[PDB]
Amino acid sequence: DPLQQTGQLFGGLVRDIRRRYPYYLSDITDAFSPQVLAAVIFIYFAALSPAITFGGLLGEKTRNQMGVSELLISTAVQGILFALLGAQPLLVVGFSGPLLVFEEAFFSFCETNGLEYIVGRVWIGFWLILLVVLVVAFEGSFLVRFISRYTQEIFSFLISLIFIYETFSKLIKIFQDHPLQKTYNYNVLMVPKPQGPLPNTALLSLVLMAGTFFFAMMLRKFKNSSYFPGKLRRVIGDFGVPISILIMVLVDFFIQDTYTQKLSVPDGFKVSNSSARGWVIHPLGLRSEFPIWMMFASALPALLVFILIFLESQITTLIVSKPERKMVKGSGFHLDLLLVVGMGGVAALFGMPWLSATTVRSVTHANALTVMGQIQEVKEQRISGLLVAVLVGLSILMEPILSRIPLAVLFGIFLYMGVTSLSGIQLFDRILLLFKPPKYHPDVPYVKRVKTWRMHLFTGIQIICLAVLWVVKSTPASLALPFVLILTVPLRRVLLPLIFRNVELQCLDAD
Amino acid sequence: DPLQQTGQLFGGLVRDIRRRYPYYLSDITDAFSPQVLAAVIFIYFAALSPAITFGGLLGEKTRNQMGVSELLISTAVQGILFALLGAQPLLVVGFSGPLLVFEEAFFSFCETNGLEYIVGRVWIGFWLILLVVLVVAFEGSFLVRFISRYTQEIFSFLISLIFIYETFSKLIKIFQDHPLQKTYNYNVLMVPKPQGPLPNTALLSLVLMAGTFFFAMMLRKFKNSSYFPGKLRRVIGDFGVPISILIMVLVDFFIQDTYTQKLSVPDGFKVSNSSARGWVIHPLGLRSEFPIWMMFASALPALLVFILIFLESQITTLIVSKPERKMVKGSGFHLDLLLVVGMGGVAALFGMPWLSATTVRSVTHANALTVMGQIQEVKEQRISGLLVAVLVGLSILMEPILSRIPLAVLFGIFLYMGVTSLSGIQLFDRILLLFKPPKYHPDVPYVKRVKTWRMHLFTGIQIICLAVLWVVKSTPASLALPFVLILTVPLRRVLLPLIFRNVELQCLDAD
Ligand SMILES: *[C@@H]1O[C@H](CO)[C@@H](O)[C@H](O)[C@H]1NC(C)=O
Ligand SMILES: *[C@@H]1O[C@H](CO)[C@@H](O)[C@H](O)[C@H]1NC(C)=O
C-alpha cells in the first residue's frame, strides 16, 4: 500500500505522514522500557565510533576542510530531526564508505581544476534538494517496488561482509603498526600518535576485541537461555552489549602500563580548519568567484550522490521494515527520502557532510529493539533515535568518559554487530545449506518445492553477484557499486526466469 | 556382580582375569579406526605435558634425585605394562599432585633426619608390594562397594575443578613472570629460562591458550553439528584436538620474534643426578647405612601412599567403567590395583616414581574413545594405551617436534579437557539447576520424585563437601585430602538418611 503510484503530486509524502503521525503519542510513550535504554547506549557507541573514524579519515584526505567536528554536528542534528519527524525513526543516519570515496574524488577533482571544494559541495547540495523535491513530487520512490528480496538480500549480505572485513582490516592495521618484535625503542613519542612499534599493544587490542565479541555472544545466548529468572535474564540479555563494553573498559582501565588506542573527540564545537572555512559557506566563493560552468555542471556529481543516497536509504528501509520483522506501525519511503536528502543538502550548505541511512547500524538498532518471545514484536519509538543523536552531539562535552573507551572494544562490538546482522537473511541460510547434506535442510518452501541442485545454483548465482560487487568496490570505480547493484534487478526479472521456472522463483524469492 | 567377595583367596583377581582376558583379540582388532588414532595423539600430549611438568617440579623440590627423565621412563614402562596386562586398558597411569606433595614431604623429612631419601622410597615400595599382595589376597577392593555415586561425583567434580584451577594458575604465573610493562630490559638471557620480563610473551600465551580452547570447542560442536557429510564430519570431530594443536602450533611457529615457553625434554635416557644415584638402588644404602628403625617404620608412610593410590585408582575405575558410559567388555577392580601398586613398588626398586591411575586423563581417554550416536558405544582396546605409553617413552627421540610445541597450546587443551570432563556428572547438572527456575528443570526422576528445595539442599551439602575438600587441599595437610573424602561415605550412609527420606536418596543417589 505505501509503495503505490498516485495521481496527486506529493501523494506518497502526505500518505506517509497520514499513516505515521497518528502513532506519535504511542512512539513517545513506548520508550519506557530497559530495552530502549540498552539499545540507546548500544546505538550511541555504534554511531559515535564510526562517526569518529569517518571524521578523522575525512580530515585526513581533505585539507581539514571537513573533519570530525563537522561530521559529529551534522550527524547529531540530522539524527535529532529525523527521529523527531521521520516516518521510520528506527533508522539512523550516518556517514558511509561510498560517501567518503565520493568526497575524496570530488576534492581531488576540485584541486585539479582549482575550484573551491566546499562551495562545490554547497551547489551539489542545492542540486540534491531540487532533485529530491522533484522525485517526491513525481512519486519516484515507488520504483523501489522493483527492488525484490533478491537485491535487498544481496545488498545486506555484501554490506555486512564489508563491515566484518573492515573490522578485521582495522585489526590487521593495528598489528602492522606495532609488529611483534624482539625489541622496541624506548621513550617513544605519542603526542599525535605512536611514532614507532609498541610492545603488547597489538596483542592487547586483539585480546580486548575477542573478549568483547565473546562476552556479547555469551550475553546474547544468555538472553535466550533459561539459566535465570525470566525478567532478570531478559533485562541482563538486552543490556548485553553495554555489559560487554563496561567489562572490557574496566579491564583496560586496570591495565596502566600498556597503551591501547582510545576514542579521540575534539575540544569544543568548532570548524576543523578555521582559516580554510567558516561556519556558513558563501555559495559564490570564499576566496574566488565560483564559475557558472560548475554551477551548472554540479548536477552530474549531484545526480551520482542522489542515486547513491536514495538507493542505500531505500534498500535499508526495505530491509528494516520487512513484514517478517513484525513492524506494525508502518514505514514511509517518500517522507524518509525527502528528509534525508533535503537535510543532507542543507548540511552541505552549512559546510557539514550529507549522510544516508546506514544499513548495519539501522539493522542493529532494529534488532536491539526487537522483542523475542520467533519475533513477538518490535519496540518502535522515536526517543531511542533522539537520545542517540543527542548523545552524539554531546560527545564533545563527555571527553573524560570517551577517553577511557578503547578502540578494540568497539572493534569487537562491530564484529558482533556484523555477525548478528548476517542473521535473518535467507541468502546466509542458503550459504549455510550449501555445506549441509540434503537430509538436514530445514522445512521451508524453498527446500521442498525446489530440487536441491536448483537451489544451490540460485545460491551460486547470488554468490557470483556478491563477488562482482566486491570486485567493483575494490576497484577504484567504487562509486559504480550501487549502479551494478541496480543491474541485479533486471537479472532477477529477465535473465533468471530463463533459467528457473516460475514456481522456483516464487518460492526462492518472495516477500 | 564382578565386584563381590568370594570364598577363594585372590578371588577378585582370578575373576577379573577370566573375565577380561577372553576379549584380548577383540581389543587388539578393535583399534582399527581413525578415532583410535586421534585419541592416541590427544592422550599422548595430555599425558606427556603433565608428566614433563611434574618431572620438572620433582627435580625442583628434590636435589634432582627424582627428575623428569625418571618420571618419563616410569610412566612409559608402566603404561605399556598396564595396557598389555590390565583389565581396564582405557585407564592411563601417571603422576598426581598428592604424589608430588607426599614426595616433597618425605624428602624434607629424610633430609631433616639425615638418611637417604631414595632408599626410603624403595623400602616404601617393598611395603607397598606387600600391602597390595595382602589386600588382593583378602579381596579388599570390594570395600569400594561402599563408595556410591555421592563420593565418586564429589571426587570427580573436585578433581576437574583442580585441573581448571591449575591451568588458570599457570596462566596467572606466566603473566606475573612477564608483567605488562611500559619498558623491558634488552639483551635478556634465556639460557635456563628468561631472567627478566619479556614483551608480548604473556599476551601471546593467553591468546594461544584461548585460541586452542576455542578451536577445540568449535570442533567438538562441529562433530555433533549437521554440517558436512556425516563420515567426514565425524572424522574431523574425532581429530578435533589434534587439529587445534596443529593450528596453534603453526600459528606460534610463524611468529619468529616473540618468545613462548616450549616443552623441554631431556637429551638421552639418563638419571637426572648421576652423582647422587645410579639406575639400580641398593636397599641397604648407597653411602649412608640404612637403620633398621626406618626399615620397620616405613610402613606408615607406605600405608598412606597405598591408601592414596588405591583410593584414587579405584574411584577413577568406578567413574570410567560406569554402566551409563556403555562399557560392555568388563572392568577390573582387583587386577588393576595389583598391577598399579606392584609396578609402582618395582619402579621404587629401580629409582622411578610410583604412578596412580589419574582421573582427568583417564576420563578424557574414555570420552575420546566414546562413540556418540546418546552414547552408542565406547571403543575399548589396549592399542591406544600401548601407543600412548610407547610415544611417551620415545618423547626423548622427538626433541625437535616437542620443542616446536608451545605450552600455552597445552594449557588451552587442559582447560578443554577439564570442562569436557565436567560433563556427564549429575552433580554439575544440579549445580546448573541451582540457577534455573523450577519450570526449566530437565526430565529426570530426581526432579519429579523430590521437591525443588530438597534437591537444592542436597546440592548445597555436596557443595559444602567440595569446599571442605578444597580447603583441606590448600591446607598443608594435603595428604589428608583423600581421607576426608572417605568421610563422605558415612555421611551418605548415616547422616544423610536422617535429613532425606529413603525415596529422595534413592532418586538423587543411584547407580
Ligand atoms: C587548513 O587549510 C589550509 C588552507 O587554508 C591548508 O594549507 C592546511 O593544510 C589546512 N590545515 C591542515 C592541518 O591540513
Ligand atoms: C645432585 O646431588 C648433589 C649431592 O651432592 C646436590 O648437591 C646437587 O644439587 C644435585 N643436583 C645436581 C644437578 O647436581
Curated annotation (Swiss-Prot), chains A, B:
<dbReference type="GO" id="GO:0045852">
    <property type="term" value="P:pH elevation"/>
</dbReference>
<feature type="topological domain" description="Cytoplasmic">
    <location>
        <begin position="223"/>
        <end position="233"/>
    </location>
</feature>
<feature type="transmembrane region" description="Helical; Name=5">
    <location>
        <begin position="150"/>
        <end position="172"/>
    </location>
</feature>
<feature type="site" description="Important for anion transport">
    <location>
        <position position="221"/>
    </location>
</feature>
<feature type="site" description="Important for anion-proton cotransport">
    <location>
        <position position="312"/>
    </location>
</feature>
<feature type="topological domain" description="Cytoplasmic">
    <location>
        <begin position="88"/>
        <end position="90"/>
    </location>
</feature>
<keyword id="KW-0813">Transport</keyword>
<feature type="transmembrane region" description="Helical; Name=7">
    <location>
        <begin position="234"/>
        <end position="254"/>
    </location>
</feature>
<dbReference type="GO" id="GO:0007596">
    <property type="term" value="P:blood coagulation"/>
</dbReference>
<feature type="transmembrane region" description="Discontinuously helical; Name=3">
    <location>
        <begin position="91"/>
        <end position="107"/>
    </location>
</feature>
<dbReference type="GO" id="GO:0072562">
    <property type="term" value="C:blood microparticle"/>
</dbReference>
<keyword id="KW-0039">Anion exchange</keyword>
<comment type="function">
    <text>(Microbial infection) Acts as a receptor for P.falciparum (isolate 3D7) MSP9 and thus, facilitates merozoite invasion of erythrocytes. Acts as a receptor for P.falciparum (isolate 3D7) MSP1 and thus, facilitates merozoite invasion of erythrocytes.</text>
</comment>
<dbReference type="GO" id="GO:0030506">
    <property type="term" value="F:ankyrin binding"/>
</dbReference>
<comment type="similarity">
    <text>Belongs to the anion exchanger (TC 2.A.31) family.</text>
</comment>
<dbReference type="GO" id="GO:0140900">
    <property type="term" value="F:chloride:bicarbonate antiporter activity"/>
</dbReference>
<feature type="topological domain" description="Cytoplasmic">
    <location>
        <begin position="138"/>
        <end position="149"/>
    </location>
</feature>
<keyword id="KW-0597">Phosphoprotein</keyword>
<dbReference type="GO" id="GO:0016323">
    <property type="term" value="C:basolateral plasma membrane"/>
</dbReference>
<dbReference type="GO" id="GO:0055085">
    <property type="term" value="P:transmembrane transport"/>
</dbReference>
<dbReference type="GO" id="GO:0016020">
    <property type="term" value="C:membrane"/>
</dbReference>
<keyword id="KW-0360">Hereditary hemolytic anemia</keyword>
<dbReference type="GO" id="GO:0006820">
    <property type="term" value="P:monoatomic anion transport"/>
</dbReference>
<dbReference type="GO" id="GO:0048821">
    <property type="term" value="P:erythrocyte development"/>
</dbReference>
<feature type="transmembrane region" description="Helical; Name=11">
    <location>
        <begin position="383"/>
        <end position="403"/>
    </location>
</feature>
<keyword id="KW-0812">Transmembrane</keyword>
<feature type="topological domain" description="Cytoplasmic">
    <location>
        <begin position="316"/>
        <end position="331"/>
    </location>
</feature>
<dbReference type="GO" id="GO:0009898">
    <property type="term" value="C:cytoplasmic side of plasma membrane"/>
</dbReference>
<feature type="topological domain" description="Extracellular">
    <location>
        <begin position="59"/>
        <end position="66"/>
    </location>
</feature>
<dbReference type="GO" id="GO:0072659">
    <property type="term" value="P:protein localization to plasma membrane"/>
</dbReference>
<feature type="region of interest" description="Involved in anion transport">
    <location>
        <begin position="190"/>
        <end position="261"/>
    </location>
</feature>
<feature type="transmembrane region" description="Discontinuously helical; Name=10">
    <location>
        <begin position="351"/>
        <end position="368"/>
    </location>
</feature>
<dbReference type="GO" id="GO:0006821">
    <property type="term" value="P:chloride transport"/>
</dbReference>
<keyword id="KW-0406">Ion transport</keyword>
<feature type="lipid moiety-binding region" description="S-palmitoyl cysteine">
    <location>
        <position position="465"/>
    </location>
</feature>
<keyword id="KW-0007">Acetylation</keyword>
<keyword id="KW-0225">Disease variant</keyword>
<dbReference type="GO" id="GO:1902476">
    <property type="term" value="P:chloride transmembrane transport"/>
</dbReference>
<keyword id="KW-0564">Palmitate</keyword>
<keyword id="KW-0095">Blood group antigen</keyword>
<feature type="transmembrane region" description="Helical; Name=1">
    <location>
        <begin position="35"/>
        <end position="58"/>
    </location>
</feature>
<dbReference type="GO" id="GO:0005452">
    <property type="term" value="F:solute:inorganic anion antiporter activity"/>
</dbReference>
